[PDB]
Tab-separated table of all heavy atoms in Angstrom:
chain	number	residue	atom	x	y	z
A	9	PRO	N	108.844	129.546	74.982
A	9	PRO	CA	108.725	130.899	74.529
A	9	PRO	C	108.022	131.899	75.381
A	9	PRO	O	108.005	133.077	75.080
A	9	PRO	CB	108.095	130.843	73.141
A	9	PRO	CG	107.279	129.534	73.199
A	9	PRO	CD	108.262	128.658	73.984
A	10	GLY	N	107.325	131.408	76.431
A	10	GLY	CA	106.721	132.175	77.476
A	10	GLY	C	107.040	131.499	78.769
A	10	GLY	O	106.204	131.223	79.622
A	11	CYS	N	108.303	131.064	78.915
A	11	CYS	CA	108.666	130.043	79.838
A	11	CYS	C	108.545	130.103	81.321
A	11	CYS	O	108.172	129.134	81.975
A	11	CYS	CB	109.972	129.285	79.547
A	11	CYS	SG	109.785	127.520	79.148
A	12	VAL	N	108.958	131.149	82.074
A	12	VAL	CA	108.894	132.529	81.701
A	12	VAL	C	110.047	132.935	80.844
A	12	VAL	O	111.160	132.433	80.848
A	12	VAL	CB	108.842	133.435	82.896
A	12	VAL	CG1	107.653	132.977	83.749
A	12	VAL	CG2	110.158	133.481	83.703
A	13	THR	N	109.806	134.006	80.065
A	13	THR	CA	110.911	134.708	79.495
A	13	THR	C	110.967	136.059	80.107
A	13	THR	O	111.607	136.972	79.587
A	13	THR	CB	110.983	134.664	77.993
A	13	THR	CG2	111.152	133.193	77.595
A	14	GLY	N	110.222	136.164	81.230
A	14	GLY	CA	110.307	137.181	82.232
A	14	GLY	C	109.711	138.473	81.811
A	14	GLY	O	109.577	139.516	82.450
A	15	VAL	N	109.179	138.464	80.571
A	15	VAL	CA	108.380	139.506	79.987
A	15	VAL	C	107.010	139.628	80.562
A	15	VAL	O	106.600	140.760	80.767
A	15	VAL	CB	108.544	139.604	78.498
A	15	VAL	CG1	107.788	138.505	77.723
A	15	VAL	CG2	108.215	141.034	78.034
A	16	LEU	N	106.257	138.553	80.840
A	16	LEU	CA	106.473	137.235	81.348
A	16	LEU	C	106.540	136.215	80.265
A	16	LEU	O	107.299	135.251	80.250
A	16	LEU	CB	105.365	136.791	82.327
A	16	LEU	CG	105.774	137.222	83.735
A	16	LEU	CD1	105.516	138.718	84.014
A	16	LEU	CD2	105.020	136.324	84.739
A	17	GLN	N	105.639	136.441	79.292
A	17	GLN	CA	105.323	135.538	78.229
A	17	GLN	C	105.012	136.228	76.956
A	17	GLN	O	104.792	137.431	76.878
A	17	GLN	CB	104.179	134.606	78.675
A	17	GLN	CG	102.805	135.253	78.851
A	17	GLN	CD	101.764	134.261	79.355
A	17	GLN	OE1	102.057	133.151	79.797
A	17	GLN	NE2	100.443	134.571	79.223
A	18	UNK	N	105.162	135.490	75.837
A	18	UNK	CA	105.534	136.080	74.651
A	18	UNK	C	106.853	136.729	74.527
A	18	UNK	O	107.047	137.916	74.240
A	18	UNK	CB	105.189	135.201	73.471
A	19	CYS	N	107.955	136.003	74.816
A	19	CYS	CA	109.300	136.475	74.725
A	19	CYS	C	109.749	136.537	73.300
A	19	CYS	O	110.280	137.563	72.889
A	19	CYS	CB	110.244	135.636	75.598
A	19	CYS	SG	109.503	135.382	77.235
A	20	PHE	N	109.435	135.528	72.470
A	20	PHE	CA	109.587	135.672	71.047
A	20	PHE	C	108.431	135.201	70.232
A	20	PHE	O	107.971	134.095	70.472
A	20	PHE	CB	110.843	134.955	70.526
A	20	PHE	CG	111.569	135.743	69.497
A	20	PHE	CD1	112.524	136.570	70.043
A	20	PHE	CD2	111.342	135.609	68.147
A	20	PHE	CE1	113.209	137.366	69.147
A	20	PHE	CE2	112.029	136.446	67.299
A	20	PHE	CZ	113.007	137.276	67.788
A	21	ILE	N	108.090	135.989	69.187
A	21	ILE	CA	106.867	135.831	68.459
A	21	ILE	C	107.372	135.644	67.078
A	21	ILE	O	108.273	136.424	66.757
A	21	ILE	CB	105.795	136.868	68.633
A	21	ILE	CG1	106.274	138.310	68.409
A	21	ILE	CG2	105.189	136.560	70.015
A	21	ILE	CD1	105.146	139.332	68.249
A	22	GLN	N	106.921	134.718	66.210
A	22	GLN	CA	105.705	133.967	66.292
A	22	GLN	C	105.875	132.583	66.814
A	22	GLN	O	104.896	131.914	67.141
A	22	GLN	CB	104.789	134.028	65.055
A	22	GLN	CG	103.314	133.803	65.382
A	22	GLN	CD	102.513	134.793	66.216
A	22	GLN	OE1	103.024	135.707	66.857
A	22	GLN	NE2	101.171	134.531	66.287
A	23	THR	N	107.137	132.136	66.970
A	23	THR	CA	107.344	130.810	67.465
A	23	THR	C	106.930	130.550	68.878
A	23	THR	O	107.104	129.488	69.469
A	23	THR	CB	108.667	130.205	67.110
A	23	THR	CG2	109.807	130.693	68.024
A	24	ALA	N	106.225	131.510	69.499
A	24	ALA	CA	105.340	131.301	70.609
A	24	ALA	C	104.186	130.430	70.259
A	24	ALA	O	103.669	129.658	71.076
A	24	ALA	CB	104.938	132.624	71.276
Side-chain angles (χ1 to χ4, degrees), residues 9-12 14-22 24:
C11 246
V12 305
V15 77
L16 271 79
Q17 69 183 12
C19 314
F20 221 90
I21 52 166
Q22 207 66 348

